[PDB]
C-alpha cells in the first residue's frame, strides 16, 4: 500500500491588516496532523494528532521558524503578483502553495509535488517528471522562465526526492 | 520535515 504527505500553505492579503492571513496545514495520508494559524495569539506549528506528541521541542522549534519564514515569502510575493497582473493595492488577494511526496509501496518516492495558485486559478506547477514546469498565463510564464534558468526543479527535487520522503517514513513509524 | 524556502516569483 502506497502512502503520501501533503502541505497546504495559504495566504490572504487585504485592506487594513497589512500582514497576510497565513494558514499552513499538512496532511499525512489524508489525515490532518499539523496546523499553523497566523491569527493565533502565538503563531506556531502544533500537532493535530496524538502520535505527533512524541517530537522533541527541537522539532516544533525550527519547524515554526520555517513558517515564520514562509509568512514573509507570501507577504513579499503576494506583492509582486499583484504587480504581474496590474491590480489595485487595496484589493484583497490569495496566494497558495502545495507540495509533498507520495511514496510508493516499496518506500521510494512515487510522485513529487510543488505548485502555486493565485486567487483560485492555477499558476505554476512542477510536472510529474520533477524537471519541467507548466505555466498558466503570461505571468505564470515569467516566473517559469526564470525558475527554469535558476534550475528551480532541481532545488525542490532535492527535497521531494529524499528529504520529504525520509520524513514521511519518519511519521508513518509513529503510528 | 519541511520543504526549503521557495524561489522568488
Amino acid at each position: 500500500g502506497p502512502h503520501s504527505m501533503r502541505y497546504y500553505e495559504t495566504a490572504t492579503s487585504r485592506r487594513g491588516l497589512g500582514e497576510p492571513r497565513y494558514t499552513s496545514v499538512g496532511y499525512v495520508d489524508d489525515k490532518e496532523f499539523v496546523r499553523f494559524d497566523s491569527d493565533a495569539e502565538n503563531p506556531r506549528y502544533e500537532p493535530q494528532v496524538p502520535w505527533m506528541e512524541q517530537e522533541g521541542p527541537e522539532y516544533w522549534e525550527r519547524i515554526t521558524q520555517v513558517a515564520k519564514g514562509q509568512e514573509q515569502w507570501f507577504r513579499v510575493n503576494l506583492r509582486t503578483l499583484l504587480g504581474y497582473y496590474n491590480q489595485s493595492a487595496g484589493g484583497t488577494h490569495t496566494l497558495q502553495r502545495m507540495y509533498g511526496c507520495d511514496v510508493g509501496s516499496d518506500g521510494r518516492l512515487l510522485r513529487g509535488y510543488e505548485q502555486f495558485a493565485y486567487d483560485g486559478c492555477d499558476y505554476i506547477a512542477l510536472n510529474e517528471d520533477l524537471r519541467t514546469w507548466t505555466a498558466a498565463d503570461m505571468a505564470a510564464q515569467i516566473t517559469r522562465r526564470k525558475w527554469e534558468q535558476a534550475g528551480a526543479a532541481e532545488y525542490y527535487r532535492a527535497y521531494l526526492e529524499g528529504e520529504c520522503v525520509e520524513w514521511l517514513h519518519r511519521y508513518l513509524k509513529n503510528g | 520535515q519541511l520543504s526549503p524556502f521557495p524561489f522568488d516569483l
Epitope: 515569502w73 513579499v76 506583492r79 535558476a150 527535487r157 529524499g162 | 522568488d8
Partner: T-cell receptor, first 110, second 109 residues
C-alpha cells in the same frame, strides 16, 4: 553582479554610528549582509526576505538593518568599535544562489 | 557546519588541483563553491542542488558530491596562474542562507 555598495571604503571612529548602504538591480527579493574580517569566512549579520523584512543573522549584535525598498538594503553600526572592523559584503538572490557586491572595506579608528 | 581542512594549498602551474570539503548535516543540503579574487566579492563557481553528483563549473572547474563520505570536493584539471585566490565551500539548508567555510588560499608558481 549588478549589486553595488557605497562607499567603496569608509572610516569609522569609535562610538560613531555608521550606516553602510546597498543597491541591487537583480530584482531579487532576498538580500543579505555578510562581514569578512581577515579575508576568511564571511558571516551573515543581517538579511531581508523582502522590502520591509529584517532578520538577524548569526551575529547581529551591535547592528541594525533596514529594507525600505526592493533594492536598497542598509546595514547600520550602532556604535563603531575596533573589533567591528572588516570588509562587509551585501548580497542578493532569488533563493538558491547569492550574488555578492564589491564589498566595503570599513576601518575603525580610536 | 561545513569544514575545509586545508587553509593554505599551493600547486605548480599546470598541475592538477583539488580542494576538499565536508558537511555535517542531518540530510541532503545544497552545496556551492564560491571563489574570491583579492579585493573582490565571492563568485559562484559551481553548484549542486540535485542530480548528477558531478557538477560542471565556469573555467574547467568541477566538483563531486558524495552522501556516503558526505563531501563536496572541488577540482580543476590544469590550474593556470590566474586561478590563484581563495576558495570557499558553502552550504544552505536554512532559508537562502549560505554558511561558508574557512576557505582555502590556492597559490600557483
Amino acid at each position: 553582479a549588478a549589486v553595488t555598495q557605497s562607499p567603496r571604503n569608509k572610516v569609522a571612529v569609535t562610538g560613531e554610528k555608521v550606516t553602510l548602504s546597498c543597491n541591487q538591480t537583480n530584482n531579487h527579493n532576498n538580500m543579505y549582509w555578510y562581514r569578512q574580517d581577515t579575508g576568511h569566512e564571511l558571516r551573515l549579520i543581517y538579511y531581508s526576505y523582502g522590502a520591509g523584512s529584517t532578520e538577524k543573522g548569526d551575529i547581529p549584535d551591535g547592528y541594525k538593518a533596514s529594507r525600505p525598498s526592493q533594492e536598497n538594503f542598509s546595514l547600520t553600526l550602532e556604535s563603531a568599535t575596533p573589533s567591528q572592523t572588516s570588509v562587509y559584503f551585501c548580497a542578493s538572490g532569488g533563493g538558491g544562489t547569492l550574488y555578492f557586491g564589491a564589498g566595503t572595506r570599513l576601518s575603525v579608528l580610536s | 557546519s561545513v569544514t575545509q581542512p586545508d587553509a593554505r594549498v599551493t600547486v605548480s602551474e599546470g598541475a592538477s588541483l583539488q580542494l576538499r570539503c565536508k558537511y555535517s548535516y542531518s540530510a541532503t543540503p545544497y552545496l556551492f563553491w564560491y571563489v574570491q579574487y583579492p579585493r573582490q566579492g565571492p563568485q559562484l563557481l559551481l553548484k549542486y542542488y540535485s542530480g548528477d553528483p558531478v557538477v560542471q563549473g565556469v573555467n574547467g572547474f568541477e566538483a563531486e558530491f558524495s552522501k556516503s563520505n558526505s563531501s563536496f570536493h572541488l577540482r580543476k584539471a590544469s590550474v593556470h596562474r590566474s586561478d590563484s585566490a581563495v576558495y570557499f565551500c558553502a552550504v544552505s539548508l536554512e532559508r537562502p542562507y549560505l554558511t561558508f567555510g574557512s576557505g582555502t588560499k590556492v597559490i600557483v608558481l
